[PDB]
Amino acid sequence: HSFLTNDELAVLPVVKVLPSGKYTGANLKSVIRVLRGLLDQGIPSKELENLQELKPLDQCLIGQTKENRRKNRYKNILPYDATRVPLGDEGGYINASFIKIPVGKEEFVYIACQGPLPTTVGDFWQMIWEQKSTVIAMMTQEVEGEKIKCQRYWPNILGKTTMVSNRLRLALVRMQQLKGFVVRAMTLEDIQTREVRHISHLNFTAWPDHDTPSQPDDLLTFISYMRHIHRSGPIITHCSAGIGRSGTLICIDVVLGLISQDLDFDISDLVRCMRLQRHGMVQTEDQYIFCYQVILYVLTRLQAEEEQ
Questions:
Q1: 239 labelled catalytic
Q2: Domains of the chain: which residue ranges?
Q3: Residues near 194 by Cβ (< 8 Å), separated by ≥ 6?
Q4: Is residue 243 annotated as involved in ligand binding?
Q5: How far apart are CA 219 and CA 191, in angstroms?
Q6: DSSP-assigned letter for residue 173
Q7: Is 209 annotated as a binding residue?
């Protein structure tokens, strides 16, 4: 098929525009006024301050065992035991957590995890196969500056298959470079059953660790594309630690989904919900403020189109 075009992307809705409701006309202006008011008074910063006071779901015991410690990129960034993603019938360990958020009549399901280590590449793909995910949102570059953020866990040569585990064969069939992100098409096969799955790997590269996107419009396009291609299964969202950029992505994705169904949203409640499933989601004050800024931005664009 054709390479992704900008036109194809521009038509993809960031939010579903409704005839009326909370986000049209006078009501939309009122929401914009409120959001601007909150940012102007530094409310988001205060909300985050309160959220960092939220106690952990559990002690993350499994990720701390001597046999597992080595499977963590960061010794202190661990999945809770209660919501961890298990590997195989044996319940093997991987630094990954299920994060589910009700979004009106829909439910957004993610697996937020750390970027795979050279020694957990097989584990990662096992998880993707077992959890039936076909969409991966990698919100980090492999290396940023002089720092390693995530080891490449796919073949870098087009068409060459490789066994990432005893049962799973992985191949890179296509790579496309867009503004701010990369789209890679991969095939994942259980050579025993011969079942072949098509994995869409979305790599947003214009978002530095502990920072905010350098290209907000491109992130919105990225999100609308991720939403558009997702058919079923949890969406894998990872970065380096699996909490900052992934949490910010989830928050925005969810708020846009709420707006699309003419529903209210509360960013603090949303981040609190995420943090009770994987500790630390949305890492910095600026990332939390960014959630507010980009939604305000989306709403102002909506208003601009409305006065078409």
A1: yes
A2: 1-308
A3: none
A4: yes
A5: 36
A6: E
A7: yes
